[PDB]
Symmetry: C4
Amino acid sequence: MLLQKEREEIVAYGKKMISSGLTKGTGGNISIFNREQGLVAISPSGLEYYETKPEDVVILNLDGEVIEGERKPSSELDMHLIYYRKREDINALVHTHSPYAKTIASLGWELPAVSYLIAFAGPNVRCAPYETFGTKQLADAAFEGMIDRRAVLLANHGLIAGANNIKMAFTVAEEIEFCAQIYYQTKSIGEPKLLPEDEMENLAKKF
Amino acid sequence: MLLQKEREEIVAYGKKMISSGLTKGTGGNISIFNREQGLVAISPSGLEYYETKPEDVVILNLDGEVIEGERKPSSELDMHLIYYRKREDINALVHTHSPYAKTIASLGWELPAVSYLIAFAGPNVRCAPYETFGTKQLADAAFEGMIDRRAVLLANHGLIAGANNIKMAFTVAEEIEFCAQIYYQTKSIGEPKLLPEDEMENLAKKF
Amino acid sequence: MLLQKEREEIVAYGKKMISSGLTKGTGGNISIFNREQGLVAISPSGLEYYETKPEDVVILNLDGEVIEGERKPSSELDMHLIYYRKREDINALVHTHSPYAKTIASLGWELPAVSYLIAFAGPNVRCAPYETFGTKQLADAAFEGMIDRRAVLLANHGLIAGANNIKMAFTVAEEIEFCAQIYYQTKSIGEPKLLPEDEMENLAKKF
Amino acid sequence: MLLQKEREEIVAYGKKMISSGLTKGTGGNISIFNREQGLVAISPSGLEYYETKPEDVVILNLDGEVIEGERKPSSELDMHLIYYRKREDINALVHTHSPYAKTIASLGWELPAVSYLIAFAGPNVRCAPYETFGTKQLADAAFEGMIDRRAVLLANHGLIAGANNIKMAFTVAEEIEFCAQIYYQTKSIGEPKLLPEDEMENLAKKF
Ligand SMILES: [Mn+2]
Ligand SMILES: [Mn+2]
Ligand SMILES: [Mn+2]
Ligand SMILES: [Mn+2]
């Protein structure tokens, strides 16, 4: 099959999404870009992650046309494709429905520098205002909210994280969910101390 | 045995209830309707879900009489039977004692459109006022609270979800518990943004 | 060995304590009374529950003297023995360090009728004021706080539950921890609705 | 290999960190001091705990020079070495990124005597003000914050715990995380009762 390495990685990390508590049911989705071929591997729509085999992963071109695979691709494919067209620094995307990130997103709040781990995404994580799932409007909002960042919150929906490879993309998703938990819990009982912008700059270097 | 497929499904999804954190101990219960025969498979009362075998599932008719099985049927059988008599769009029911739904229910609150996932149930989820467990009064309150919905909260008790089959019924139960977690956490620290009614209408179509 | 059935049950339910999230490390302890012999089986002090074998369980008489076993008995043995001396309706005790019960206990609050499941313990669960762990003062406070109940909260410490056998004692411990979670979460965002005393009386019968 | 017993212990307890929910990803780190040789075993930087083998553990001297091992040592090695130079009562350290401790630390708050379990660390746990991860400034702040204690909170970062051996060090880390959960949850809904200083003195003896 085409993009065999990518296909296996998508199956592996999809199970890891369920396992890590980063999603419920068949929510969320994962993609990996093969920059040499201009091909995108993406999780299939509505399938259980532990029932998903490499053959079930769908291969698309950057026009969004199916090149290999009989499964329907993720309904959120437009939100994946835009990053592989309009930036060149992202080769893998992890979209989650994780509870603490979705909590902060459902308030419409940004995630500020509550932890040094925020630097996995940038100096902060923005919240993109609501757009209907599976639309080009959501794809545009997600991209715009993530400019010069590796993650963005999606209002009343979840989070998407991107990086140079799938290992780092998953790490950003997991560590930003953890940061959202800390922000949620601190705000429950007080006002968290935040790291200053020059330190976030410093941390960007050290990471 | 009668309703063999249904019996196995009830054992499988009952374990999944415990596994998913949707219940504690022997609380909660599951039923599946065979519309062709007018027979209902239901979980047995007070048995551990991982100790429950297909033979332990009880088969009832719509009058509530036992047709096959020696176990006592769920004490909440009346709350199951009413949906198979007074609607025709539900063929499976999942009743849970899950913590975030039970939290919202114990405040006596409705669950509003905090997430697009609410559309699994409808535009919102109502809270039925308290009635004693295992009574016809609770069965009536649950049904009335769930009119034109696929789920309802039960005050100081839990949640019940229904759908055209057991896979979708479980999905509604799990996704509505998740929505209740988001509502609980957002209300802990602020006021969540809610989706407008026309969008919930739109989402009802897209789902 | 003496009380072989009891010894095996203590090992089994001790693992279940760790497994269920009802304790951390070697905290907590379990006892089972053999009323015919006047002998008490109790978990050993400071041992890991998954490393504990039936031979490690200690057998005491009601004077608190070791009858069989070389391990040191639980440091909280006095808090167990008092129930087997001063009541006759309890034959097994589960003492937990579970997070939501310990939360309510550390505020010094009672647990009111927030759920019909409270009836596993009684109309409510009292909070015994603080006494040093492993003392006769704590044993007295626990007993007095649990008069005409099957569970009591221990200020800044945890919970103890008792019943006619070990299966029901564990059930009380688990369901009361769950009720404490509901109380904690409802109080986080509002004021829970409570069940009236006549209904708790009714539920006492139905259980 | 040198410090073989220590190497195996570091691999075992590192997995236990992930398993127990005391860290995310490759965050956190563990060290064990061999006082007879003046050698320190420490977890390797940036490696997955379930992928870490005893050969991957790094052996350092108290000057911070690598003596055996080809992996890069933990980026937080300075924060480990200072305890083995400037005290003589600590032979093992567990550094965690656990959620409730990190919550209290991100408010800049001390952890007071909310539970008798606090005595695993001392009469309270201080919060060291923020310093950049992997620096000598953080090492100094951590040490100073932990004077006459077995644990300290690290602002916007996590916790470190130390004791006479690795079993007790892990226990301090786990029990102090649990105490932080209780403090966080009590503060969410009220004002916890605290144990008086003379009782914490008493508990220091009894432990
Ligand atoms: Mn999504
Ligand atoms: Mn129920
Ligand atoms: Mn205890
Ligand atoms: Mn760290």
